[PDB]
Amino acid sequence: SMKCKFCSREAYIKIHYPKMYLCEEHFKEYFERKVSRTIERYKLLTKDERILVAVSGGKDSAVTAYVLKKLGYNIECLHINLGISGYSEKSEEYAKKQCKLIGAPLHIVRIKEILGYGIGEVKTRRPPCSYCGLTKRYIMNKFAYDNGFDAIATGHNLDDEASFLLNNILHWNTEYLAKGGPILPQQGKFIKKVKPLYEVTEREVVAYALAVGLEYIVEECPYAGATTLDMKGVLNELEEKRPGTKFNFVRGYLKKKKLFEPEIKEIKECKICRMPSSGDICAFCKFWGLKKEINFKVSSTDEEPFG
Ligand SMILES: [Zn+2]
Ligand SMILES: [Zn+2]
């Protein structure tokens, strides 16, 4: 109970699969090997690829960027500052401190600077979270496309997958349920999106961040009581009662995911930015009322202006 399975050092955490108590260093190894297997299993990345990590200042993206760097991947990071007064400044400061420790270049996009408004400052009854998700997802893909990155890696973990799944099944969001899993392959101007933490729990992510010295922000905004926090608690209660519930729900989902494909509405190029649009002008451009394209091509980072 008190000691590590592979050494005489004090146990740091208890790992359920396989059953084992691991010290700080054997946990780090376990974790990294788990991420490494997820990459190979779903053929997520190759070491020749230039990977962009979307870093929010939260633990999930911090850990994603940290483990990919440790594994030997070619990674660069992107932080999207949402311009939320009293939130966005510390979020950026957190993301900078993380990328300095990781030793990865950090690119910053300030929404307030390019668009004029922060998330929650736009005159709309539309909840800040919906248009924020739209904004982040667009900036991530366009920054990556504009700078010739081959793949985007996000920090979503098993708990995020299972919670997103439960919410969407409860609202029967079958379109969202067709576009799921650890990899959204590269299609047109959509850059390949990957989730290397897909098979690791939020608990394991928290323990990794603390053991390697990563400091992160819990809340990215003051606009997040949403369903996901309720779903995670639900799934945790079901997981402590029936161990293997979360894994099975996601494993089962990946096998049946096919059934939701006919629900997909059959994707042209935007007339403003030339990015994937369902209509004449894409949702991002239509929302922000843009008549001009945003060029995310960078010659260098702010912390390394001469490289
Ligand atoms: Zn040990
Ligand atoms: Zn557009």
Side-chain angles (χ1 to χ4, degrees), residues 252-266 268-299:
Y253 163 70
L254 291 167
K255 299 186 99 277
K256 305 291 189 283
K257 202 191 110 184
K258 290 153 187 170
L259 300 163
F260 305 107
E261 206 257 280
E263 289 293 83
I264 292 307
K265 295 286 166 277
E266 56 278 86
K268 49 221 263 180
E269 258 182 15
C270 170
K271 285 168 177 175
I272 303 301
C273 71
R274 269 177 273 104
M275 292 311 284
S277 179
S278 78
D280 284 8
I281 295 148
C282 80
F284 179 87
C285 286
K286 255 203 153 189
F287 180 76
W288 290 108
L290 308 165
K291 294 197 170 188
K292 288 178 190 175
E293 191 195 312
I294 309 157
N295 188 21
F296 291 105
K297 175 60 185 276
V298 295
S299 182

mmCIF file of all heavy atoms in Angstrom, residues 252-299, unseen atoms left out:
data_model
loop_
_atom_site.group_PDB
_atom_site.id
_atom_site.type_symbol
_atom_site.label_atom_id
_atom_site.label_comp_id
_atom_site.label_asym_id
_atom_site.label_seq_id
_atom_site.Cartn_x
_atom_site.Cartn_y
_atom_site.Cartn_z
ATOM 1 N N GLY A 252 -16.890 0.952 -26.650
ATOM 2 C CA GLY A 252 -18.147 0.619 -27.315
ATOM 3 C C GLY A 252 -18.546 1.671 -28.330
ATOM 4 O O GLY A 252 -18.945 1.341 -29.446
ATOM 5 N N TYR A 253 -18.373 2.956 -27.956
ATOM 6 C CA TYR A 253 -18.699 4.084 -28.811
ATOM 7 C C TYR A 253 -17.922 4.045 -30.109
ATOM 8 O O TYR A 253 -18.532 4.184 -31.163
ATOM 9 C CB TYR A 253 -18.545 5.435 -28.080
ATOM 10 C CG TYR A 253 -18.474 6.608 -29.029
ATOM 11 C CD1 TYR A 253 -19.591 7.013 -29.754
ATOM 12 C CD2 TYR A 253 -17.272 7.272 -29.258
ATOM 13 C CE1 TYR A 253 -19.519 8.061 -30.668
ATOM 14 C CE2 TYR A 253 -17.191 8.330 -30.160
ATOM 15 C CZ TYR A 253 -18.323 8.734 -30.848
ATOM 16 O OH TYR A 253 -18.246 9.779 -31.736
ATOM 17 N N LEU A 254 -16.591 3.830 -30.034
ATOM 18 C CA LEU A 254 -15.698 3.764 -31.198
ATOM 19 C C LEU A 254 -16.068 2.680 -32.202
ATOM 20 O O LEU A 254 -15.800 2.859 -33.380
ATOM 21 C CB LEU A 254 -14.221 3.639 -30.775
ATOM 22 C CG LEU A 254 -13.609 4.875 -30.097
ATOM 23 C CD1 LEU A 254 -12.297 4.540 -29.463
ATOM 24 C CD2 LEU A 254 -13.469 6.040 -31.068
ATOM 25 N N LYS A 255 -16.734 1.604 -31.753
ATOM 26 C CA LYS A 255 -17.198 0.484 -32.581
ATOM 27 C C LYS A 255 -18.544 0.779 -33.248
ATOM 28 O O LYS A 255 -18.837 0.213 -34.304
ATOM 29 C CB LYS A 255 -17.336 -0.791 -31.728
ATOM 30 C CG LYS A 255 -16.037 -1.262 -31.078
ATOM 31 C CD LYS A 255 -16.177 -2.607 -30.369
ATOM 32 C CE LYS A 255 -15.685 -3.760 -31.212
ATOM 33 N NZ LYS A 255 -16.716 -4.216 -32.181
ATOM 34 N N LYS A 256 -19.369 1.638 -32.628
ATOM 35 C CA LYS A 256 -20.716 1.967 -33.115
ATOM 36 C C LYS A 256 -20.818 3.336 -33.761
ATOM 37 O O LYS A 256 -21.834 3.643 -34.377
ATOM 38 C CB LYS A 256 -21.774 1.812 -31.994
ATOM 39 C CG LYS A 256 -21.798 0.447 -31.309
ATOM 40 C CD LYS A 256 -22.299 -0.679 -32.218
ATOM 41 C CE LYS A 256 -22.510 -1.956 -31.450
ATOM 42 N NZ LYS A 256 -21.233 -2.653 -31.159
ATOM 43 N N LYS A 257 -19.771 4.141 -33.627
ATOM 44 C CA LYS A 257 -19.605 5.500 -34.157
ATOM 45 C C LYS A 257 -20.097 5.607 -35.620
ATOM 46 O O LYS A 257 -20.611 6.652 -36.027
ATOM 47 C CB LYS A 257 -18.105 5.893 -34.055
ATOM 48 C CG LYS A 257 -17.823 7.394 -34.059
ATOM 49 C CD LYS A 257 -16.329 7.693 -34.235
ATOM 50 C CE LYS A 257 -16.057 8.286 -35.595
ATOM 51 N NZ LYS A 257 -14.611 8.505 -35.827
ATOM 52 N N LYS A 258 -19.940 4.511 -36.387
ATOM 53 C CA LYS A 258 -20.357 4.359 -37.781
ATOM 54 C C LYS A 258 -21.841 4.714 -37.967
ATOM 55 O O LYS A 258 -22.180 5.443 -38.896
ATOM 56 C CB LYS A 258 -20.124 2.900 -38.222
ATOM 57 C CG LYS A 258 -18.658 2.490 -38.374
ATOM 58 C CD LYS A 258 -18.463 0.987 -38.145
ATOM 59 C CE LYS A 258 -17.001 0.599 -38.124
ATOM 60 N NZ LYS A 258 -16.804 -0.803 -37.666
ATOM 61 N N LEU A 259 -22.717 4.208 -37.061
ATOM 62 C CA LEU A 259 -24.179 4.387 -37.068
ATOM 63 C C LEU A 259 -24.659 5.834 -37.153
ATOM 64 O O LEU A 259 -25.772 6.074 -37.618
ATOM 65 C CB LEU A 259 -24.834 3.705 -35.852
ATOM 66 C CG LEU A 259 -24.653 2.200 -35.690
ATOM 67 C CD1 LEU A 259 -24.995 1.773 -34.272
ATOM 68 C CD2 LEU A 259 -25.467 1.421 -36.720
ATOM 69 N N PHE A 260 -23.839 6.782 -36.698
ATOM 70 C CA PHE A 260 -24.165 8.204 -36.710
ATOM 71 C C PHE A 260 -23.696 8.917 -37.977
ATOM 72 O O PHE A 260 -24.088 10.067 -38.185
ATOM 73 C CB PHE A 260 -23.621 8.899 -35.446
ATOM 74 C CG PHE A 260 -24.067 8.274 -34.145
ATOM 75 C CD1 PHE A 260 -23.181 7.541 -33.369
ATOM 76 C CD2 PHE A 260 -25.372 8.428 -33.691
ATOM 77 C CE1 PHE A 260 -23.593 6.964 -32.166
ATOM 78 C CE2 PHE A 260 -25.786 7.841 -32.493
ATOM 79 C CZ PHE A 260 -24.894 7.115 -31.739
ATOM 80 N N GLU A 261 -22.864 8.249 -38.826
ATOM 81 C CA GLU A 261 -22.336 8.830 -40.080
ATOM 82 C C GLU A 261 -23.449 9.271 -41.051
ATOM 83 O O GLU A 261 -23.335 10.384 -41.561
ATOM 84 C CB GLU A 261 -21.303 7.920 -40.772
ATOM 85 C CG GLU A 261 -20.313 8.668 -41.655
ATOM 86 C CD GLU A 261 -20.586 8.571 -43.145
ATOM 87 O OE1 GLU A 261 -20.227 7.533 -43.749
ATOM 88 O OE2 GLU A 261 -21.132 9.544 -43.714
ATOM 89 N N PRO A 262 -24.566 8.516 -41.252
ATOM 90 C CA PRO A 262 -25.637 9.024 -42.129
ATOM 91 C C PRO A 262 -26.276 10.345 -41.670
ATOM 92 O O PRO A 262 -26.973 10.977 -42.466
ATOM 93 C CB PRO A 262 -26.665 7.890 -42.122
ATOM 94 C CG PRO A 262 -25.912 6.689 -41.724
ATOM 95 C CD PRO A 262 -24.902 7.167 -40.749
ATOM 96 N N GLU A 263 -26.044 10.768 -40.402
ATOM 97 C CA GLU A 263 -26.590 12.021 -39.859
ATOM 98 C C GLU A 263 -25.789 13.254 -40.290
ATOM 99 O O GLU A 263 -26.229 14.384 -40.061
ATOM 100 C CB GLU A 263 -26.754 11.965 -38.322
ATOM 101 C CG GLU A 263 -27.869 11.055 -37.829
ATOM 102 C CD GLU A 263 -29.295 11.463 -38.159
ATOM 103 O OE1 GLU A 263 -29.759 11.164 -39.284
ATOM 104 O OE2 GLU A 263 -29.967 12.037 -37.274
ATOM 105 N N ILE A 264 -24.623 13.035 -40.922
ATOM 106 C CA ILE A 264 -23.750 14.103 -41.401
ATOM 107 C C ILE A 264 -24.358 14.781 -42.623
ATOM 108 O O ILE A 264 -24.728 14.109 -43.590
ATOM 109 C CB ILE A 264 -22.287 13.608 -41.612
ATOM 110 C CG1 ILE A 264 -21.605 13.252 -40.267
ATOM 111 C CG2 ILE A 264 -21.435 14.590 -42.436
ATOM 112 C CD1 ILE A 264 -21.642 14.365 -39.143
ATOM 113 N N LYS A 265 -24.477 16.123 -42.547
ATOM 114 C CA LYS A 265 -25.045 16.963 -43.598
ATOM 115 C C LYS A 265 -23.992 17.344 -44.647
ATOM 116 O O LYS A 265 -23.111 18.174 -44.394
ATOM 117 C CB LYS A 265 -25.783 18.185 -43.000
ATOM 118 C CG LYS A 265 -27.025 17.819 -42.163
ATOM 119 C CD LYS A 265 -28.229 17.367 -43.011
ATOM 120 C CE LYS A 265 -29.305 16.689 -42.192
ATOM 121 N NZ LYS A 265 -29.007 15.252 -41.962
ATOM 122 N N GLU A 266 -24.081 16.681 -45.817
ATOM 123 C CA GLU A 266 -23.189 16.827 -46.970
ATOM 124 C C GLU A 266 -23.549 18.026 -47.848
ATOM 125 O O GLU A 266 -22.679 18.590 -48.511
ATOM 126 C CB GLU A 266 -23.128 15.517 -47.795
ATOM 127 C CG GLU A 266 -24.465 14.982 -48.296
ATOM 128 C CD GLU A 266 -25.274 14.178 -47.295
ATOM 129 O OE1 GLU A 266 -26.033 14.792 -46.513
ATOM 130 O OE2 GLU A 266 -25.159 12.931 -47.302
ATOM 131 N N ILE A 267 -19.708 20.682 -48.041
ATOM 132 C CA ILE A 267 -18.587 21.400 -47.432
ATOM 133 C C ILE A 267 -17.666 22.037 -48.493
ATOM 134 O O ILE A 267 -16.816 21.367 -49.092
ATOM 135 C CB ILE A 267 -17.804 20.485 -46.494
ATOM 136 N N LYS A 268 -17.882 23.341 -48.729
ATOM 137 C CA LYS A 268 -17.169 24.182 -49.688
ATOM 138 C C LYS A 268 -16.114 25.086 -49.004
ATOM 139 O O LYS A 268 -15.748 24.832 -47.855
ATOM 140 C CB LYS A 268 -18.181 24.981 -50.543
ATOM 141 C CG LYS A 268 -19.264 25.713 -49.749
ATOM 142 C CD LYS A 268 -20.648 25.626 -50.404
ATOM 143 C CE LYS A 268 -20.989 26.844 -51.233
ATOM 144 N NZ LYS A 268 -22.336 26.738 -51.848
ATOM 145 N N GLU A 269 -15.586 26.099 -49.731
ATOM 146 C CA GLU A 269 -14.594 27.064 -49.233
ATOM 147 C C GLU A 269 -15.263 28.396 -48.979
ATOM 148 O O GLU A 269 -16.039 28.854 -49.816
ATOM 149 C CB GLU A 269 -13.477 27.276 -50.262
ATOM 150 C CG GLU A 269 -12.192 26.530 -49.956
ATOM 151 C CD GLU A 269 -11.062 26.770 -50.942
ATOM 152 O OE1 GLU A 269 -11.137 27.741 -51.734
ATOM 153 O OE2 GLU A 269 -10.089 25.981 -50.914
ATOM 154 N N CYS A 270 -14.946 29.035 -47.844
ATOM 155 C CA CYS A 270 -15.497 30.335 -47.465
ATOM 156 C C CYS A 270 -15.119 31.375 -48.497
ATOM 157 O O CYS A 270 -14.031 31.309 -49.061
ATOM 158 C CB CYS A 270 -15.041 30.737 -46.065
ATOM 159 S SG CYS A 270 -15.441 32.445 -45.619
ATOM 160 N N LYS A 271 -16.021 32.317 -48.766
ATOM 161 C CA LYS A 271 -15.784 33.364 -49.760
ATOM 162 C C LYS A 271 -14.945 34.515 -49.206
ATOM 163 O O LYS A 271 -14.448 35.335 -49.979
ATOM 164 C CB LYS A 271 -17.106 33.830 -50.385
ATOM 165 C CG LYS A 271 -17.651 32.802 -51.378
ATOM 166 C CD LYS A 271 -19.081 33.073 -51.811
ATOM 167 C CE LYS A 271 -19.546 32.066 -52.835
ATOM 168 N NZ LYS A 271 -20.985 32.238 -53.176
ATOM 169 N N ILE A 272 -14.739 34.543 -47.875
ATOM 170 C CA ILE A 272 -13.923 35.546 -47.180
ATOM 171 C C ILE A 272 -12.507 34.991 -46.914
ATOM 172 O O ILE A 272 -11.541 35.505 -47.469
ATOM 173 C CB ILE A 272 -14.617 36.087 -45.878
ATOM 174 C CG1 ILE A 272 -16.027 36.715 -46.156
ATOM 175 C CG2 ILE A 272 -13.713 37.057 -45.088
ATOM 176 C CD1 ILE A 272 -16.099 37.923 -47.169
ATOM 177 N N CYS A 273 -12.398 33.941 -46.088
ATOM 178 C CA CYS A 273 -11.126 33.361 -45.659
ATOM 179 C C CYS A 273 -10.677 32.127 -46.432
ATOM 180 O O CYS A 273 -9.551 31.675 -46.199
ATOM 181 C CB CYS A 273 -11.171 33.066 -44.165
ATOM 182 S SG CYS A 273 -12.263 31.684 -43.719
ATOM 183 N N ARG A 274 -11.545 31.540 -47.285
ATOM 184 C CA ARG A 274 -11.257 30.325 -48.063
ATOM 185 C C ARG A 274 -11.074 29.067 -47.170
ATOM 186 O O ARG A 274 -10.464 28.086 -47.601
ATOM 187 C CB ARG A 274 -10.074 30.526 -49.038
ATOM 188 C CG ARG A 274 -10.490 31.000 -50.421
ATOM 189 C CD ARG A 274 -9.288 31.261 -51.315
ATOM 190 N NE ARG A 274 -8.765 32.622 -51.159
ATOM 191 C CZ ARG A 274 -7.657 32.939 -50.496
ATOM 192 N NH1 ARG A 274 -6.923 31.993 -49.921
ATOM 193 N NH2 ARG A 274 -7.267 34.203 -50.412
ATOM 194 N N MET A 275 -11.624 29.096 -45.944
ATOM 195 C CA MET A 275 -11.572 27.973 -45.006
ATOM 196 C C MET A 275 -12.860 27.129 -45.128
ATOM 197 O O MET A 275 -13.853 27.651 -45.650
ATOM 198 C CB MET A 275 -11.319 28.446 -43.559
ATOM 199 C CG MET A 275 -9.916 29.032 -43.322
ATOM 200 S SD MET A 275 -8.480 28.074 -43.915
ATOM 201 C CE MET A 275 -8.397 26.810 -42.671
ATOM 202 N N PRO A 276 -12.868 25.829 -44.707
ATOM 203 C CA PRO A 276 -14.082 25.006 -44.875
ATOM 204 C C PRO A 276 -15.376 25.622 -44.341
ATOM 205 O O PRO A 276 -15.512 25.934 -43.159
ATOM 206 C CB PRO A 276 -13.729 23.694 -44.175
ATOM 207 C CG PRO A 276 -12.251 23.627 -44.201
ATOM 208 C CD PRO A 276 -11.775 25.040 -44.096
ATOM 209 N N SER A 277 -16.311 25.821 -45.256
ATOM 210 C CA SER A 277 -17.608 26.435 -45.016
ATOM 211 C C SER A 277 -18.725 25.505 -45.503
ATOM 212 O O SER A 277 -18.582 24.887 -46.559
ATOM 213 C CB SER A 277 -17.679 27.753 -45.783
ATOM 214 O OG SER A 277 -18.922 28.414 -45.630
ATOM 215 N N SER A 278 -19.836 25.419 -44.747
ATOM 216 C CA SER A 278 -21.006 24.636 -45.166
ATOM 217 C C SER A 278 -21.836 25.525 -46.124
ATOM 218 O O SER A 278 -22.381 25.028 -47.118
ATOM 219 C CB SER A 278 -21.829 24.174 -43.964
ATOM 220 O OG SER A 278 -22.636 25.215 -43.440
ATOM 221 N N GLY A 279 -21.861 26.831 -45.831
ATOM 222 C CA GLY A 279 -22.546 27.845 -46.626
ATOM 223 C C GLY A 279 -21.595 28.624 -47.512
ATOM 224 O O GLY A 279 -20.483 28.161 -47.781
ATOM 225 N N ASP A 280 -22.022 29.809 -47.988
ATOM 226 C CA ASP A 280 -21.197 30.667 -48.845
ATOM 227 C C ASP A 280 -20.035 31.292 -48.064
ATOM 228 O O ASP A 280 -18.924 31.410 -48.594
ATOM 229 C CB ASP A 280 -22.060 31.742 -49.529
ATOM 230 C CG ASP A 280 -22.903 31.231 -50.689
ATOM 231 O OD1 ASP A 280 -22.952 29.990 -50.897
ATOM 232 O OD2 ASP A 280 -23.498 32.070 -51.404
ATOM 233 N N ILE A 281 -20.307 31.671 -46.798
ATOM 234 C CA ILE A 281 -19.373 32.252 -45.833
ATOM 235 C C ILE A 281 -19.401 31.344 -44.592
ATOM 236 O O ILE A 281 -20.480 30.919 -44.177
ATOM 237 C CB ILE A 281 -19.763 33.731 -45.517
ATOM 238 C CG1 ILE A 281 -19.603 34.626 -46.773
ATOM 239 C CG2 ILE A 281 -18.954 34.296 -44.328
ATOM 240 C CD1 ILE A 281 -20.565 35.751 -46.875
ATOM 241 N N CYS A 282 -18.232 31.025 -44.016
ATOM 242 C CA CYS A 282 -18.187 30.143 -42.857
ATOM 243 C C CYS A 282 -18.718 30.805 -41.596
ATOM 244 O O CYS A 282 -18.812 32.035 -41.521
ATOM 245 C CB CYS A 282 -16.806 29.522 -42.651
ATOM 246 S SG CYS A 282 -15.595 30.602 -41.851
ATOM 247 N N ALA A 283 -19.113 29.958 -40.625
ATOM 248 C CA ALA A 283 -19.677 30.339 -39.340
ATOM 249 C C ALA A 283 -18.818 31.373 -38.594
ATOM 250 O O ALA A 283 -19.371 32.381 -38.155
ATOM 251 C CB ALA A 283 -19.915 29.100 -38.489
ATOM 252 N N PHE A 284 -17.483 31.163 -38.507
ATOM 253 C CA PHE A 284 -16.566 32.108 -37.856
ATOM 254 C C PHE A 284 -16.688 33.512 -38.468
ATOM 255 O O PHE A 284 -16.953 34.474 -37.742
ATOM 256 C CB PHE A 284 -15.110 31.609 -37.934
ATOM 257 C CG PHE A 284 -14.085 32.530 -37.299
ATOM 258 C CD1 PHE A 284 -13.783 32.436 -35.942
ATOM 259 C CD2 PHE A 284 -13.407 33.477 -38.063
ATOM 260 C CE1 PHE A 284 -12.824 33.273 -35.362
ATOM 261 C CE2 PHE A 284 -12.465 34.334 -37.473
ATOM 262 C CZ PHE A 284 -12.179 34.223 -36.129
ATOM 263 N N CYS A 285 -16.507 33.608 -39.805
ATOM 264 C CA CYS A 285 -16.599 34.838 -40.584
ATOM 265 C C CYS A 285 -17.956 35.490 -40.491
ATOM 266 O O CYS A 285 -18.021 36.719 -40.398
ATOM 267 C CB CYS A 285 -16.219 34.585 -42.037
ATOM 268 S SG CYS A 285 -14.455 34.363 -42.301
ATOM 269 N N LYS A 286 -19.042 34.676 -40.555
ATOM 270 C CA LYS A 286 -20.418 35.161 -40.482
ATOM 271 C C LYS A 286 -20.686 35.780 -39.128
ATOM 272 O O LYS A 286 -21.220 36.881 -39.075
ATOM 273 C CB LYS A 286 -21.430 34.044 -40.798
ATOM 274 C CG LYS A 286 -22.064 34.163 -42.183
ATOM 275 C CD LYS A 286 -23.406 33.436 -42.257
ATOM 276 C CE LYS A 286 -24.318 34.047 -43.305
ATOM 277 N NZ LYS A 286 -25.708 33.505 -43.242
ATOM 278 N N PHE A 287 -20.262 35.106 -38.043
ATOM 279 C CA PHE A 287 -20.431 35.566 -36.661
ATOM 280 C C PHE A 287 -19.707 36.878 -36.361
ATOM 281 O O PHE A 287 -20.303 37.798 -35.818
ATOM 282 C CB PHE A 287 -20.026 34.469 -35.641
ATOM 283 C CG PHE A 287 -20.199 34.912 -34.208
ATOM 284 C CD1 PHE A 287 -21.464 34.968 -33.627
ATOM 285 C CD2 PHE A 287 -19.103 35.327 -33.454
ATOM 286 C CE1 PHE A 287 -21.629 35.422 -32.315
ATOM 287 C CE2 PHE A 287 -19.272 35.801 -32.146
ATOM 288 C CZ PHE A 287 -20.533 35.844 -31.587
ATOM 289 N N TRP A 288 -18.416 36.943 -36.682
ATOM 290 C CA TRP A 288 -17.551 38.097 -36.422
ATOM 291 C C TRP A 288 -17.736 39.278 -37.419
ATOM 292 O O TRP A 288 -17.162 40.348 -37.208
ATOM 293 C CB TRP A 288 -16.090 37.624 -36.349
ATOM 294 C CG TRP A 288 -15.798 36.814 -35.123
ATOM 295 C CD1 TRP A 288 -15.581 35.466 -35.060
ATOM 296 C CD2 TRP A 288 -15.750 37.295 -33.770
ATOM 297 N NE1 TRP A 288 -15.376 35.079 -33.752
ATOM 298 C CE2 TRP A 288 -15.479 36.181 -32.939
ATOM 299 C CE3 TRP A 288 -15.911 38.561 -33.180
ATOM 300 C CZ2 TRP A 288 -15.377 36.295 -31.545
ATOM 301 C CZ3 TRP A 288 -15.790 38.675 -31.806
ATOM 302 C CH2 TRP A 288 -15.546 37.549 -31.000
ATOM 303 N N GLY A 289 -18.560 39.075 -38.450
ATOM 304 C CA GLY A 289 -18.845 40.057 -39.492
ATOM 305 C C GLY A 289 -17.595 40.522 -40.210
ATOM 306 O O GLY A 289 -17.386 41.731 -40.369
ATOM 307 N N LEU A 290 -16.736 39.561 -40.612
ATOM 308 C CA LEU A 290 -15.472 39.837 -41.294
ATOM 309 C C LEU A 290 -15.601 39.791 -42.813
ATOM 310 O O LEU A 290 -16.198 38.869 -43.375
ATOM 311 C CB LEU A 290 -14.341 38.902 -40.805
ATOM 312 C CG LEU A 290 -14.112 38.818 -39.289
ATOM 313 C CD1 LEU A 290 -13.262 37.625 -38.938
ATOM 314 C CD2 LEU A 290 -13.528 40.104 -38.726
ATOM 315 N N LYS A 291 -15.032 40.792 -43.469
ATOM 316 C CA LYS A 291 -15.044 40.907 -44.924
ATOM 317 C C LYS A 291 -13.624 40.707 -45.451
ATOM 318 O O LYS A 291 -13.400 40.727 -46.663
ATOM 319 C CB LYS A 291 -15.626 42.274 -45.354
ATOM 320 C CG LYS A 291 -17.106 42.457 -45.009
ATOM 321 C CD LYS A 291 -17.738 43.599 -45.804
ATOM 322 C CE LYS A 291 -19.244 43.626 -45.656
ATOM 323 N NZ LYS A 291 -19.880 44.609 -46.571
ATOM 324 N N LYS A 292 -12.664 40.493 -44.522
ATOM 325 C CA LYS A 292 -11.244 40.277 -44.817
ATOM 326 C C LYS A 292 -10.691 39.061 -44.082
ATOM 327 O O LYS A 292 -11.092 38.775 -42.953
ATOM 328 C CB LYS A 292 -10.408 41.528 -44.480
ATOM 329 C CG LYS A 292 -10.617 42.689 -45.450
ATOM 330 C CD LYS A 292 -9.819 43.917 -45.049
ATOM 331 C CE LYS A 292 -10.210 45.129 -45.856
ATOM 332 N NZ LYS A 292 -9.510 46.348 -45.372
ATOM 333 N N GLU A 293 -9.767 38.352 -44.732
ATOM 334 C CA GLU A 293 -9.103 37.163 -44.195
ATOM 335 C C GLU A 293 -8.071 37.568 -43.120
ATOM 336 O O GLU A 293 -7.473 38.644 -43.208
ATOM 337 C CB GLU A 293 -8.405 36.407 -45.346
ATOM 338 C CG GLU A 293 -7.899 35.015 -45.010
ATOM 339 C CD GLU A 293 -6.923 34.410 -46.002
ATOM 340 O OE1 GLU A 293 -7.200 34.445 -47.223
ATOM 341 O OE2 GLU A 293 -5.877 33.891 -45.551
ATOM 342 N N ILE A 294 -7.887 36.705 -42.105
ATOM 343 C CA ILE A 294 -6.875 36.888 -41.063
ATOM 344 C C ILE A 294 -5.738 35.959 -41.443
ATOM 345 O O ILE A 294 -5.955 34.749 -41.590
ATOM 346 C CB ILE A 294 -7.382 36.591 -39.609
ATOM 347 C CG1 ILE A 294 -8.694 37.340 -39.297
ATOM 348 C CG2 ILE A 294 -6.289 36.950 -38.589
ATOM 349 C CD1 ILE A 294 -9.518 36.759 -38.211
ATOM 350 N N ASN A 295 -4.539 36.518 -41.623
ATOM 351 C CA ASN A 295 -3.346 35.749 -41.959
ATOM 352 C C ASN A 295 -2.573 35.427 -40.678
ATOM 353 O O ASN A 295 -2.042 36.326 -40.017
ATOM 354 C CB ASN A 295 -2.475 36.488 -42.995
ATOM 355 C CG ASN A 295 -1.307 35.685 -43.545
ATOM 356 O OD1 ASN A 295 -1.268 34.450 -43.496
ATOM 357 N ND2 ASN A 295 -0.355 36.373 -44.151
ATOM 358 N N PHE A 296 -2.544 34.143 -40.311
ATOM 359 C CA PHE A 296 -1.868 33.681 -39.104
ATOM 360 C C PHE A 296 -0.410 33.283 -39.342
ATOM 361 O O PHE A 296 0.263 32.899 -38.385
ATOM 362 C CB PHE A 296 -2.673 32.576 -38.414
ATOM 363 C CG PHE A 296 -3.963 33.086 -37.800
ATOM 364 C CD1 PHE A 296 -5.186 32.826 -38.400
ATOM 365 C CD2 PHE A 296 -3.949 33.828 -36.622
ATOM 366 C CE1 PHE A 296 -6.369 33.297 -37.833
ATOM 367 C CE2 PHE A 296 -5.135 34.314 -36.070
ATOM 368 C CZ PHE A 296 -6.334 34.037 -36.673
ATOM 369 N N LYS A 297 0.110 33.468 -40.581
ATOM 370 C CA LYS A 297 1.519 33.191 -40.897
ATOM 371 C C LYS A 297 2.473 34.060 -40.072
ATOM 372 O O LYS A 297 2.432 35.286 -40.135
ATOM 373 C CB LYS A 297 1.829 33.278 -42.402
ATOM 374 C CG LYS A 297 3.320 33.112 -42.755
ATOM 375 C CD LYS A 297 3.893 31.759 -42.320
ATOM 376 C CE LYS A 297 5.368 31.642 -42.551
ATOM 377 N NZ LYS A 297 5.657 31.221 -43.942
ATOM 378 N N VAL A 298 3.300 33.389 -39.268
ATOM 379 C CA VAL A 298 4.270 34.004 -38.371
ATOM 380 C C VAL A 298 5.668 33.690 -38.849
ATOM 381 O O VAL A 298 5.910 32.593 -39.361
ATOM 382 C CB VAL A 298 4.068 33.636 -36.859
ATOM 383 C CG1 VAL A 298 2.744 34.171 -36.323
ATOM 384 C CG2 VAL A 298 4.204 32.136 -36.586
ATOM 385 N N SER A 299 6.595 34.640 -38.665
ATOM 386 C CA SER A 299 7.985 34.426 -39.024
ATOM 387 C C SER A 299 8.767 33.932 -37.791
ATOM 388 O O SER A 299 9.825 33.310 -37.948
ATOM 389 C CB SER A 299 8.590 35.705 -39.590
ATOM 390 O OG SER A 299 9.938 35.499 -39.980
#
